[PDB]
Design a protein around this ligand. Structure first.
Ligand SMILES: [Zn+2]
Ligand SMILES: [Zn+2]
Lengths: 448, 451
């Protein structure tokens, strides 16, 4: 089954030559791209043909950190302002009322926002399982909306009966965690090229569980070929806690647990030291940059430019909607460029460097070689922005930079795994007005 | 004439009690607000009745710095990255081809972006006048789109062949600057309440003109009762240049020039020191905070929280579209909150403080008491965001914070001076797709100009 995107004003490929093709054309069969180029690919009819004049086509953005259940709890009044301590203490007793239907809908809500703002692959970090919630419920929602999903079995063990902050209803026994995590891997992990569903193992933070679960998790992930994800060094407290309790820097504590390698990626890394950047570069460890979260939570300016210069694989993440509180992937791309410039100078990040993090960087951090750019044999994952909107008026001097320097609206078109999921700005895979409405009634229900 | 906006989910007034009314209602006739309240107001006679169920109403956001002509020259490739020195030198020769029509259309383009993102009053800082352009051309476009406009006669005298970066076609004779400025005040400045047009005088920077032109300009604003605007201390260079040539801080050189007072407002002020903050606080001098520009140009994090604690009047600006490069007022409000928090901590700026900068603070910096919040006798300047979009899904726990912490789309409705200028997300005062087409059609002409 064939799909032809023809005569885009600018087809950004992100391929090995970083081709930016004027009048560029894209030919798809099934889930993969057959060729990127020009009018040469239009001479035969295709089962579907979509004119893309006046549009920029880019590879689909890849979101590499999230907490989609938190899209049910944005701007909770008690949590909008204050210290991360009050943030957790105010939000945990609420999240203790999450029901499996809420995980299933809240996955689609968060996913719809990312998709309409240009994202074709996302991870999630669901690490709470009250009232019979399961990673399966999140997966059911991802399958319905058609997004490429990296589901993380997040976990927590240290609750209030062990000196921790999470209530006891929101922690679990480490043996039950390893057993659910292995059941999830066996039931959902597709390791083949163009997989639409993959599992990674992901304790919430190296301090939310025992060191034994950190090591046992990595052993299991290595045995099964899945990735490892966690929160690492997102603020000053993280650094102090690691030095005070384990006498190590967060990077050193990470290396010590086996949690380095191209099958690992750490979220935030705002306070990664120079030695930790060197370590992550030579072992291939990835970082998920969450610039809006780092600002909205007063975490800091991660040394992203320092990491890229030294060779670190960096992807982009919006983080949970209680710590952003938006899910706008292209705006997060914009934000990474703005925040890097104000922290490190007028040469710290341009439009193409940001967009590369949001595409190739995310694929690398998720340990995937089949997404992130547009070339023969790659997954058919791309979006298209209308260039004649008011938002981009006067910015056609560079359609690629226009997306990062201006604030565009929704994408016009989106193709995930070869399937046209957004047409003229309308989500095709779900009844979006109905899901949004349902989402808001559960959020009202969850909060009261 | 009469208009009723009824049953909003949340009507945030920004009034003296900061009332945030559930089911809030707004009763307008002409340009006034006649009454603010609740269900009681449905007994009131109205010519037209507008249901705002599921919407949040906020007072219209007030933009206090711009360069609307630069919306024809966004993401210019040579200017996307590098030092401000390369930014100026790549963009000056381009802007030297501006025609009066380009000013007339780009003003509408720039204003439309602001209006669809929640802004009802904006100033501008047009400081180039090549090929017979005039501030009149800006004004013609503003009158057509219906936005409340504070038009600044920007000016520049220190150009090339005189030790400056602006080319010689983009400088002007200091006597002609004062003479066209007095013509603009006499012909356009409406000092009456609910004025839709006010003039302010605004040399580009204290160093872009002679000291005489700054003082003569300051005397004229005082003599005519108008305001004064300029860029002050936006970067390290600006501060060092002042210490080097005049042995003073930019705030000191400003006070030394007469350029302080409640009729003055300075853009950026990224490097204002503690004493200059105190100086601005006791003199009532205003600042226009421009967070996106401050980042996209690697200027720095301005100490807005320090200024508010000291009593400084702070408004918000998007700045010219070549140093942002967007014109989204609500996202600029969000951005000001994010950037203050990452610079100074989790208590440096909440949703309500940022929105207050975008409303009352913008009204104060402009020296206006008839806009900026919703109460009996205020101008009918407000917008309404649909709360049931995907962007705000799960954020109805606080509709006001939702506007700052999430990324909403365009407004659903907009009212400036009593005129419903946006209906169900659709701009009413111009043929927007057609103006957008012309805008891109002229920017192409400008960029391929011979230079
Ligand atoms: Zn997170
Ligand atoms: Zn400016």
């Amino acid at each position: 089954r064939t799909l032809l995107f023809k005569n885009a004003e600018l087809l950004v490929t992100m391929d090995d030559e970083r081709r930016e093709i004027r009048g560029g054309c894209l030919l798809v069969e099934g889930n993969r791209i057959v060729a990127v180029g020009g009018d040469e690919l239009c001479a035969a009819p295709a089962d579907e043909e979509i004119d893309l004049r006046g549009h920029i086509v880019i590879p689909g953005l890849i979101n590499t950190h999230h907490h989609m259940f938190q899209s049910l709890t944005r701007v909770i009044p008690d949590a909008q302002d204050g210290e991360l301590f009050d943030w957790l203490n105010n939000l945990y007793p609420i999240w203790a009322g999450l029901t499996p239907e809420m995980i299933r809908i809240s996955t689609q809500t968060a996913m719809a926002e990312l998709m309409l703002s240009g994202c074709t692959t996302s991870s999630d970090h669901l690490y709470v399982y009250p009232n019979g919630c399961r990673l399966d419920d999140s997966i059911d929602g991802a399958r319905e909306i058609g997004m490429r999903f990296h589901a993380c079995r997040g976990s927590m063990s240290v609750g209030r009966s062990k000196g921790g902050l999470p209530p006891d209803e929101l922690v679990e026994n480490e043996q039950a965690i390893l057993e659910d995590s292995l059941r999830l891997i066996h039931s959902y992990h597709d390791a083949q090229r163009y997989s639409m569903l993959r599992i990674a193992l992901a304790p919430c933070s190296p301090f939310s569980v025992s060191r034994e679960l950190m090591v046992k998790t990595a052993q299991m992930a290595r045995e099964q070929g899945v990735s490892l994800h966690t929160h690492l060094a997102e603020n000053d407290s993280d650094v102090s806690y690691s030095q005070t309790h384990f006498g190590m820097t967060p990077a050193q504590y990470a290396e010590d647990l086996g949690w380095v390698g191209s099958d690992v990626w750490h979220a935030h890394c705002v306070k990664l030291d120079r030695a930790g950047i060197s370590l992550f570069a030579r072992t291939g460890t990835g970082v998920a940059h969450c610039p809006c979260s780092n600002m909205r939570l007063a975490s800091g300016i991660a040394p992203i430019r320092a990491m890229l210069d030294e060779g670190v694989s960096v992807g982009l993440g919006v983080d949970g909607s209680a710590s952003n509180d938006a899910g706008n992937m292209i705006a997060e791309t914009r934000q990474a460029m703005l925040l890097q410039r104000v922290g490190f100078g007028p040469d710290a990040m341009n439009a193409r460097q940001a967009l590369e993090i949001a595409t190739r960087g995310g694929a690398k951090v998720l340990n995937r070689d089949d997404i992130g750019y547009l070339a023969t044999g790659m997954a058919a994952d791309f979006v298209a922005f209308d260039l004649n909107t008011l938002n981009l008026a006067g910015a056609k001097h560079d359609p690629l930079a226009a997306l990062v320097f201006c604030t565009p609206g929704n994408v016009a078109f989106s193709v995930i795994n070869g399937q046209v999921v957004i047409r003229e700005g309308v989500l095709q895979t779900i009844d979006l007005p109905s899901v949004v409405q349902q989402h808001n009634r559960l959020a009202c229900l969850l909060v009261n």
